[PDB]
Design a protein around this ligand. Structure first.
Ligand code: NA
Ligand code: NA
Ligand code: NA
Ligand code: NA
Ligand code: NA
Ligand code: NA
Lengths: 246, 238
């Protein structure tokens, strides 16, 4: 420790820890996930009398192609690649969020979670991870669960902890399969490693207060994913069980 | 609920759907991935009477070394590096797939799936991730399954769901061992009908089922082999 710098280094480590201070640091530095209220604002500021239609179009890009704007434009129809390149220019759509408030097509989808899941269901044959992939895994996997925005519809209130956890594990059956399609590397990962890679936005979505819990519940009931008393459907229990397995 | 933006979000979800509008969007945005026609089209006119041997060679390189054309030539025989480099120049072979028109050895291999898989079986001892690997995990893992091409041959019709599922499971057992060896390489595109888009093109199901029965992976009554039933077990047992 004789050098004056190694002396300072050694000293740095000889202090007591301000636990509280380091924990505030940990909280700031910690994934919080997207802000939907400001993604909506931006879409509505930007699109005006054309924002609902532009958004629907971006959400369907989200559902079917993910965030891969450029790669996808190179393989799609000319009229599609045109709209898409335009809407990117128009809203400043990015493939990966550099900042909070960056607008990725997935985040738009998430911010409007009830629509996106209904459209996912309505367009299930166009999903890269849809009915054909989910049938390999279980029977009757609910199509509404077939997008990146489902986690924001799972309740935490008005529903038992156990329900929330079954809904999460059932959703995770899809997340697992989806993750392996988006990140081929996860095809050689353990379940837990794959689970960690989507754990953070999953919890953020479930725990967020932006989209109100009572409507998540009413919606899940309406779709049949929650029974008349707020308990997951049998298909959902079957899917959670298949996730827990093997 | 509590925020005008929240209220907007739930109100957006209460909109009745316009199926026609949303399907238009879907069809026009559908990503094609691989178009085998474009690749065979290019290889053929360009090669001429010289194309079939050039394709075979490109695919043998694809089964042994994937895309690493340059890295690969650096250490292969002079004859190997010469012929191989000649073919890159001739056909425009790239290592990464940038555009829909990009020609990689793997894409060539996947445009002719039946051949590849069959070459693969016959050159199994030269496969990077082969029997030595998979005879540890099961016995008699089908050698045809041991490559990138196979996923293109999974039948989605004319067979039972139990059969499609068994083939997907049996094959995932190889994909998974193979992806691990790549996840670790010091520094790619998998393909099958179930993950592919409405836009994509595969050998028709009946040709898939026919080839499968021919190589013995499916039996003559449509049902997967023991070696497949089994090795799908190994997968299902984690
Ligand atoms: Na690990
Ligand atoms: Na119930
Ligand atoms: Na609509
Ligand atoms: Na079409
Ligand atoms: Na290995
Ligand atoms: Na049979």
């Amino acid at each position: 420790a004789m050098s004056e710098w190694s002396r300072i280094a050694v000293e740095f480590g000889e202090q007591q820890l301000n636990l509280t201070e380091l924990e505030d640091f940990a909280r700031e530095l910690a994934y919080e996930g997207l802000d939907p209220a400001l993604i909506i604002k931006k879409l509505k500021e930007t699109g005006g009398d054309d924002w609902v239609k532009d958004t629907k179009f971006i959400i369907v890009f989200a559902l079917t192609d993910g965030n891969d704007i450029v790669k996808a434009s190179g393989d799609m129809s000319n009229s599609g690649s045109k709209r898409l390149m335009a809407l990117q220019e128009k809203y400043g759509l990015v493939e990966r969020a550099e900042t909070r408030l960056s607008i990725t097509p997935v985040r738009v989808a998430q911010s409007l979670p009830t629509w996106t899941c209904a459209a996912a269901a309505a367009l299930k044959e166009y999903l890269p991870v849809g009915p054909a992939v989910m049938n390999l895994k279980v029977e009757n996997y609910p199509p509404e669960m077939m997008c990146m925005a489902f986690g924001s519809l799972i309740p935490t209130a008005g529903v038992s902890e156990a329900t929330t956890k079954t809904l999460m594990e059932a959703y995770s059956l899809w997340q697992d399969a989806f993750t392996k399609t988006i990140n081929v590397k996860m095809r050689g990962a353990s379940k837990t490693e794959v689970y960690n890679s989507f754990r953070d936005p999953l919890h953020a979505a479930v725990n967020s207060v932006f989209f109100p819990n009572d409507v998540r519940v009413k919606w899940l009931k309406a779709k049949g994913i929650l029974g008349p008393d707020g308990v997951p459907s049998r298909a959902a229990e079957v899917a959670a069980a298949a996730y827990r397995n093997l």
